[model samples]
Target: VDICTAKPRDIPMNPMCIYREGSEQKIPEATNRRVWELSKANSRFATTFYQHLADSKNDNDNIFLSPLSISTAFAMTKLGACNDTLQQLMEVFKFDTISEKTSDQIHFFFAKLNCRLYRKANKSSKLVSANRLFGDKSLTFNETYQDISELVYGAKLQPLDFKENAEQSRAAINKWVSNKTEGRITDVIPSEAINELTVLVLVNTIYFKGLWKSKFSPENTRKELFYKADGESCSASMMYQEGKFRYRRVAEGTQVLELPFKGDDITMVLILPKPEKSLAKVEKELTPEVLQEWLDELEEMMLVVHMPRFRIEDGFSLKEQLQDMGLVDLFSPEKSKLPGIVAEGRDDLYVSDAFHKAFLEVNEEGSEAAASTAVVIAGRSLPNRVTFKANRPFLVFIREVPLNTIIFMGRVANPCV
Candidate 1:
């Protein structure tokens, strides 16, 4: 959000203006800067959020989530979030550090990136990130708040009668979620989740299906053992291939491989830790700085790939995680300050429930994806052919290029399961 939106050359300090008000340069340049600025905060939020998940996760459970999805959904709440509530949201996202920060700027960042990223998508690649805020129709939401929510954040606030038809409300919300997720995820809100007392439900869902630029032949897939964390093992249909891919190995004993999707718009960063190094140890080292260093050091090489055909459908209530991250007021009835939405009764308005769900499937052909977030790359060098065999637990991240956003992140403890 530039300080100036339009025609101000006629003013006293005309030359001091950011740019000619009506110039075509404003929108694209402004958005590019916003994307650049917000990505910093997003990287922090994503890594920190992952730490929370990794710390509390079940040891043997495979974990998957869209940090982007969670941030976007929560960022939408900031539209109506006021005072301390707004401040806390900013703090959690580390948006406080953004020099010219404003609650509205962050929303616009989310909107522009969310809607602008894939301005050019084709048949082989499909990527969609959607957000919806379902508010109970009985409450009167402020008009300007409604407009800007959708306009600035692409979060179309729709009304639902949670008071009268709880089950019907659930059904409608689920149906929309299904459509946004391409029918793969049918339900995020359960029947018991919404009722007369429930005032709001903010949801975010992302879906993507992209074929690999270098397709792995299904005929080459064979039953192989995926070494589990505890010296145990499970059978996996490992896909085999031999070609050049961006690769790197950190001193931490983890190898990173960049596998590009068909359009090269997105690439999956696969990190495999040597048996002597634990994923937990590497997880602790993943600050945005460390991640950037790893990306920079990636050198292309002819690699023999052995990745298993895997699928994971996972999600959980994010309320606990958000609360633990010091996002406390927004959930508390007494301390919450979300009065911006209503004319009066701001005291009673606080987030009722929030959740995230994602689905992913990858085989010989390519993979389908999922996510949720706020305002959220290059290759060099060539080496001789190398062998990249993933016979152990590893980490996978689906990242979007140009924008440098992490669409999906998770650890595959046992893919066969």
Candidate 2:
């Protein structure tokens, strides 16, 4: 969130942020009980998020919720007369062991949202106060500057400066993406993507540039057989290693791979559609239980792994996705109400926009992390290179980092280059 928050009737709904808020709002309960409650709350958020992701894929181009949007919803998740309503919740969770890429992406998304929300005002919704359960022993609902500000200026601000400069800013953002993607991704975004009805923006940038963990011997990595759905075989980079790894074959058309990260708290999970099948078919039927089942079904196995290095950037709007997911009430202009959004007033407002973007790059070395990391680490070299080709559609996820409450997930249908 690099932009100044005090700027005129500007709304900060963009998916980038450099700052956030938290608190120690303890309830009248034992410490252990409080932790249990928070854990339950976190589980609920995670569950809803998973469902949203799966359902959205069916109606939208492939909905991708920015981490900020998810967490912000988590922060205020306890809103409405009953703490059960999903529309009036928001939260900004923190983490200590997050990767550089994940954190940078989150910051970027927050920045985008803060900028977009500054100018727009939410009217025509019933406002309801929510009680939060944060922190430990001696407190209950402690407030921060952001919370205070929400009490002060969280209102409907008249839209201002709908001009060329805004267009320039959007262009600048796209330019940044084109440069960061190394020409593999020519267009940063769609020209008509931004509109008066925009609401949420989800941005993900992933760069995987790591040498073979076991150093794939150059002789062994020589041009090898690569199979294609059309029965074509091309010489490709095949990485070989001998180690215990977690893997699974759930269906005749699907297989999963779990790659351990350098850290113990997180691991990378890959779900691949069978070579001869269309990934689009599998993507539509995915569910949270299926994902969790895949996770739980993981087991150590010894085998040879062969894949090609690739990159991809894709996005999907959530407006259609939300409706497809059965949550259309919060998005409709006629019935939508966000009293918890503004500090005061009897105006009406509903989510007008929801945008998502995800990018991934995997080369010979480890993950590039992000734009800043690429700048700092590009000059280095390795003895051997391992390649991975995601010719088939695949979903990648990084889970259980410093922030035990959050995880990173997305898909790469094709290498942008």
Candidate 3:
């Protein structure tokens, strides 16, 4: 008689630090404990991001998280560098097919648009005289900016002439971003994120100006009843519209909402957790097959969507967040295998500043979502009978952009400030 096989005893161990050249950070085991935990932590981060927006009355501007791309990019390099691990820890943030644009002596550009993870980075120091990366290049993204980096993959950080404080650096960064995004992205570089050694900036530039498939004229966006978590109600300028959308119900599961961007190809897919469901729990139980089911199940139906026109802005130092996630050694020169970061053996190259600032804008037509999925949700009972919605408790997602993937995912408790 044959017996069924089971997973090894160390099924869910956290990532381990095993030093190796070419790829220094190696997590040998598939133990998902750490990845799932990180996912939960990120969910908490998402909550804070949205809450801040609701507080700032920018809930409808858009929802975007910056580290998604950076983290995903790092994961790709890290995992690809260490491909022996069985647990497939990096699959969730799929990075195989994503393209990388690099110039021989100029810059390097990478765009990862997998549904589970969406990240794009342009690292260049010198200006490119050859071909335009995103300019009049027939099919480049309108919102994606250049001048931020000329060499597609060049690692030369943008030069800064620091006369006094870091103001010049900040202004220069902002101007570069503004010029690249064509004013659609004004405040790209957050000033507070500046420091002495480094002025690293991460901004989620989202340009989603569109006429609704069913136009919600300026006059229609009048103050309407908006439900609040406190059981109270207020008036809000709700972007109200109803039209047929490409929707789907997965495996006879809870309702899954997909909000398509103006281009019609991109979409925002939201999978509401089951009753008493925690998105985290859902993630823990998730399997590759299950996710595929969600993707496979699609249908076009009438969607009565009343979305708020809001934008959520968030800024923070990633040093702490990364440390908390178990990749501790990289912060210091001791464990970081990054070669070009330091000059000599005697000097210790520690991360001075790791700041991320992002902005997300959501309207009727489509979305631009971004984030890190080290591993993936939670749920709470939200009071019903709400009037003008977008307040109280809810989960959201943003996706389908210049790249064929989801860019941002989030949850909002209340959006009206």
Candidate 4:
């Protein structure tokens, strides 16, 4: 949940944040109701964001993201936003949809969620969320902004000599990302992503590794033909298991199945399209409302499942996508309003680019995923007694069952690809 910001000494070379230490902000504590609303809002945001990504990508490509990561990064930035810039972000994030409170209170929701994710109740399972802020040493940042970042978001600001050592700073940030994700992610900020003119980078990295409550035997896994939505086919390592699982079949021609990890706190939900190719229809019709209906209607039943062992990694520059979604002012030096990000009257700052990297690996044991999102201040199941043979393309999500917070979500269009 790191929200780093940087101000250039001269002009824009790349995109970058700074805060003070010790002093804390008086932000309100989070409540259960607020947490739930924020969870629902995030679910809606995830669905909407996925739709936008799907529209931008080829129908047959795989997509994965942690909307929570992106949302958390922006939530930190929002603390510094004002006027139309703030409102546009609120609309895009569906903060306007919260019924319990005003968009101004969204920080508490994120704070609560971060606390929940970071709490150390289980030692066997791994679920970690880390935040850090990096600022240009040459620039003078407001202490109030620093205190808010540290006190409210629990982030630390570090000074980097970006002007004299852009490559060194990039490597240091990337190494920190690698360390946070336990080496699952490397090079989150590329060499060219930062330059002398760069101002700030806000980073949030979430890493999760969970074993199945009912682990699949490696001997049971076999290479099988997997059908693609585009009518192409390939061989994939298919893991097999038979047991009672939460499952259901929707009238929309999709099957919902849940695979619980050893610790029941998290589960993987698979939504399989009956006809395989009808995945497009499912994607087109999927909304937070429809997702809620699916969650409510699922029933437990005996089932035999066959799923592919696959890995997916995706990177994105979200500046354009966000602008298209009406977050236009934040990226514009003229229209942007981030006075809170720096000091007073330093309104020339604007988000130049936003970078996101997500990785997922699902196998017989369970699933492991890591994602890092930088605002560059740019910034389910299942099923039934019915056999849930996922020999074709389908949608999948790793989530906290109670919170319905999706940690990693994507489509397995071609597992062998």
Top TM-score model: 4
The lDDT for every candidate, in the order shown, is 0.69, 0.39, 0.37, 0.74
Across 310-372, the per-residue lDDT of candidate 2 in tens digits comes to 554444443454354455445545565434433333244444444334444454443322211
TM-score of each: 0.85, 0.51, 0.54, 0.86
> Candidate 2's C-alpha lDDT?
0.39
In model 4, where is the ten-residue run with the lowest total lDDT?
Answer: 379-388
| Best-first order by lDDT | 4, 1, 2, 3
lDDT of 1 at 335: 77
Alpha-carbon shift of residue 237 in model 3 (angstroms) = 3.2
| CA shift of 371, model 4, Å | 0.4
Candidate 1 lDDT by residue in tens digits, 1-94: 3313311222211110110032112122334666666765687898998889768765456678887777777666666666777777889877
| TM-score between model 4 and native | 0.86
- Candidate 2, after superposition: displacement of residue 183 in Å? 12
- Tell me the spans in candidate 4 whose CA falls farther than 4 Å from its real position: 1-31, 100-102, 226-234, 344-347, 377-392
Q: Model 2 Cα displacement at 361 (Å)? A: 1.7
